[PDB]
Amino acid sequence: VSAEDKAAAERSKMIEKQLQKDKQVYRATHRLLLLGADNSGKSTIVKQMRIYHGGSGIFETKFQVDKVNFHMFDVGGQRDERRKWIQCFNDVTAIIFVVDSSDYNRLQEALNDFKSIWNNRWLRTISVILFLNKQDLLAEKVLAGKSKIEDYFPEFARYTTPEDATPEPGEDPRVTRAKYFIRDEFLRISTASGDGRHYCYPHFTCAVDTENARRIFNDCRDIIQRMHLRQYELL
Template sequence: MNRFQGCLREGEQEEKGQLEVIRETRRQLKEHKRLYLATRRLLLLGGNESGRSTIFKQAKILAGKALDGKREQATAVHNIRSNLKADIETVVATVKHLSPDAGLDHPEIQLSLDYIVSASAQRDFSFPPEFYEHARALWEDAGVRDCCERARLCGLMDCSGYFLDRIDVIKQPDYEPSHQDLLHCRVHTPGVFETKFQVDQVSFHLFYPEGLNYSSQVWAEYVDHLSAIVFVVDSSSYDLNFSGTNKLQEALNSFRSVCCTCPSSLCVLLFLNKQDLLAEKVLAGESKIEDHFPEFAHYTPQDATPEPGEDPRVTRAKYFIRDKFLSISRACGSEGCRCSAHFTCAVDAENLRRVFSQCANLV
């Protein structure tokens, strides 16, 4: 009898243990479902050089994943130095393109020009000390700087000069990239990347297709699980051309495709990026928006809210570009998706944090 009672107690304890496992499994599944439903899942779309990769890197920094380990840091250092080399090669190409109108302050700088041209043909470049010296000599030449500034403001050159201003830092053997260095670094690796981060206790899961065509065939498989699509635009590209097409017009065409093919249940978050560069171009007055979009000459914003201290010319320009995109989302009619526009500067961490906080209430 005692043996029977012992077996009975063992059976009850085993059954109790199984019930506890079932309850814990149900609790975990319920918590997983709660977290899943509370997470905003975003797909990051937009054209090349729109700032998508910078926004993704900002998201990784928000997640505390700027660089993982020494190997990733060494890769970042190499990529940044390669960006520096590409930038100085762009400078040399610009000088040669505008020659003889672009004079050099120091004739001996021709030696540095020839060195960079020679280095550009080398596939496995080792970044010797003389490379940095020649690059700095070129970048410090007033004639070269003036040439590049005119070319950039006229839309003939897409190079911010960020790494060229940091040559003496980047050349150091123990150089460690800063957050801003990582944000400005351009690396194109095809694939779909993702990261998770939080802003104001709201969880986000960001998907980033890099080097892929962002037509519906590419992102359709994500739609059922998405909260919103983030479409990034280079607002300063109104005077740049891509394969014979104005880059801003190309972005408008792509945006139309996204708005007219995504489900009405989705929200499109329009990130009008590079506001700092747009303001710089507008205030410089070298390249006028109306020369590329004639309708701007008669445009008056209806609901503009300027930033504190913002020049009225900048306000008018950025709202004109915003309204160009919003008119497309409205033209898609009831079949189109909701659209919310935001002015962004991807290299400004506080700006992006604020924008993501606003987006949390929209999706």
């Protein structure tokens, strides 16, 4: 080793120190992959929480809850026919799937997309946080009554409100039945294959809803808790 090689070695050592300093931050933050239909209010949630940074493409949104940093990634302006870039997101903490519950025309397409995402090979162990966005629009539409879910889904007639369901006191019971019917439609695919490897967390949120960050933080806490239970030989 000569003088120049020694100087190069010290340069590499400084680079390694900076690398460790960056590793601290990298392990400190959890990466969340945001997906949803083009009309499924995902950009609305992103804007309500924080301000995104484009650069069609990647949309980055870093938000901090309880001194824990989360990094939401919205992949927009792309054809979602295979989502073959999903192999990049095989290590995200959670997949935030936002679905508009007030569009029964595209509700079946959203259900099929959720089935594809859940049963995806690369997202076998990645938990999904399900945000049933635009609850106010759904309530208004089912209150109007001119649109029937029965003609779109024939199992609504034989569907009843679950006893587990917790509705708002000032909320119409038909609204509760519609909400929980859609949530059970999603949870059917969630429970068809995802027994122990990963879980789907459903949430009812609207455009004006502001506690989405707290829900994401709690769901990520549960996900990491189960991950540590499996990792630390407790499961």
